[PDB]
Amino acid sequence: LVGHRRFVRANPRSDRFQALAFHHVELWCADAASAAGRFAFALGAPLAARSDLSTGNSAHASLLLRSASVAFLFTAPYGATTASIPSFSPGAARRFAADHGLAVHAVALRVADAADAFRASVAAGARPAFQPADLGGGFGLAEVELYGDVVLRFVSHPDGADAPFLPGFEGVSNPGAVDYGLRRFDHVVGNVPELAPVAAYISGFTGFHEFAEFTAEDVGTAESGLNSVVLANNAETVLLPLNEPVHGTKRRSQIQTYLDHHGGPGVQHIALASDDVLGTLREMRARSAMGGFEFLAPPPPNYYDGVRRRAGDVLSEEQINECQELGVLVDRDDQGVLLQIFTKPVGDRPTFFLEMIQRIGCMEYQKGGCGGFGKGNFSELFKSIEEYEKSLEAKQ
């Protein structure tokens, strides 16, 4: 690493396969009904598809939530040839729940062809997880190891909006379901003990290029830190941050806390983009009291005087005041404005959480990664988590 300021952005467009978009993210669950049901109301992502006993699948229970291009898959084992996801392992899924509580199993990329992505990845050092399979109807599926037991899943299928999530999934449209304006996955972040081997491995087999980086001096506190690199596809629409702890500090790094509590590497957080995040957050906050998500404590009021100074030329007073009311973090550069906020942990352990983001700018379609990653927001997020961890420590 050289640090955020010294990193010269480039884009060689070195992808080894066509990484078109995030397709979905799959959580392996103790109970898919419980997780999907909670997430549906908490995020405004209505049930869109199911594959389970009611669809003839006795191998696994899968529920798909959608908010526009946000697609969350919740899969749990029952107590085989009927599986709609042939990579599914009941034993592994059962162990996963015990090992982590709620957490991400698979990060799915839509690719031109699953077999080609798999072949190109494995020829450039990817560890195979699931050999390519024809799912029928022109669908391809393959998986390789991403970090720890999280897999990178390749999905290919013909263009067409009649297309099922996957063959064997049955559509759902609930009378009176609503969304809260979530549009797409923005980024998916992994925590690992050692960054350099994982970054080399993933960039190696994907051809994904460095989009950004952050050292402890960029985003850490007096007491703790991390190092981060973000890998990106050619269009910089698929963004995969990677964090490692830094050791020898006054406190333990929140990334090491994660590894300790999670029981190994995994997805720390998933960022969900909205075209009006302030509106989205108003809806999500209304559901907080009745089992929805909560948000990390906002910065003090003086922060929001800074937001005026730094971003008052792009954001209206109405938006800035709403940012303050909702506890949103604001960062800007010459291309974009970043609005970001983090939930409290979404399961039992202080591990996995979610992020709501809006990128303002770079209108052309919007250019991928508009506004990049904000050093200012990053350092506030990090401080936020550190403070959260201290509160937990204060009650021992």
Next chain:
Amino acid sequence: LVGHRRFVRANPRSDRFQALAFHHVELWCADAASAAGRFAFALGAPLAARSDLSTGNSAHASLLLRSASVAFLFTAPYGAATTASIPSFSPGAARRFAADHGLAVHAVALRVADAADAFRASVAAGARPAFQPADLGGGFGLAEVELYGDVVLRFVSHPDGADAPFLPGFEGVSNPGAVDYGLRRFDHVVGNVPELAPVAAYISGFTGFHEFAEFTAEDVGTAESGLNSVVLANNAETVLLPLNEPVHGTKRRSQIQTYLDHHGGPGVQHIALASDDVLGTLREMRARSAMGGFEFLAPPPPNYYDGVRRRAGDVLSEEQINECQELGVLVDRDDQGVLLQIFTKPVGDRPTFFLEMIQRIGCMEQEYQKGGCGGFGKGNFSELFKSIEEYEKSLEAKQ
């Protein structure tokens, strides 16, 4: 067993300890947050208390939901033991439980006069011990015995008190904007077992709970399947514990055997939550269905509701009967009480555990309702049983 019609109601008040009320039900989870979150908005039972890392407990993560006297506890192991608020918790047993059963009830808890007394009287009358009595501090007592399979009967005792915690070490939660949908109390908790006779003898034996009602396959079965049921009751008939067994040799598998097969042994099949306005409650619950709330079994056909008009039209308004029809509520009536009952579809992934919303109308006697008002109805049970059988058939058609 002689069946519902020939069974002669008698209350010997033979409780071997003071069974004051249901206190809570505990679900052991691999993921407590997901279940508690969904249940909170599905049931209108907001988070009321927690014991977890944020309260200094590094042994288990516990969330308590409350709607008035309805109290659901969700507990999961963390990935220390001295920081537990529930000293009977075992991370190993909870992990095996979740792997074996998925989302399921582990503990049925009664408020008793004293936990040690309940345990002592229970064990002396044959109860299999699960957790020896312990003092939790603040005058709280906790003890456990085996109920059926892995499910324990938990005894909780504590002083009468305005702002006493659920259990010592649990911190209060009050969300601004929290609401409830009018659920008031637990009505009954139902166990499915392979053989009713030994379990009924065991529980009645150790508790001194008396027979409140019974049903045979001829009472409630279909042309293709059945069950047998007995209901046990405390002295006040406020704590009601039905027990179901399968009947064999029929054209289809009993839904009770379906439960055992998919659960992997005996367990809690369903829990009935009472409301003083179940139709009002159900409207609220149904408004949440589209966004991840619970769903309900399909209503019976119109001719059934022509039935409820003839059977109960004298004591129900047309508005109530019409709403029962809209919502798929089943209606039964005896000489004392009217029963309004409806079942959810399975509440987790497996077609095992489900919930019931019930209202009992009558037996008003300050102002209090007599326990067990309306008893259990042969009519409603038959239709609930038929609903499950129909549900199962829809599942099988998709193979």
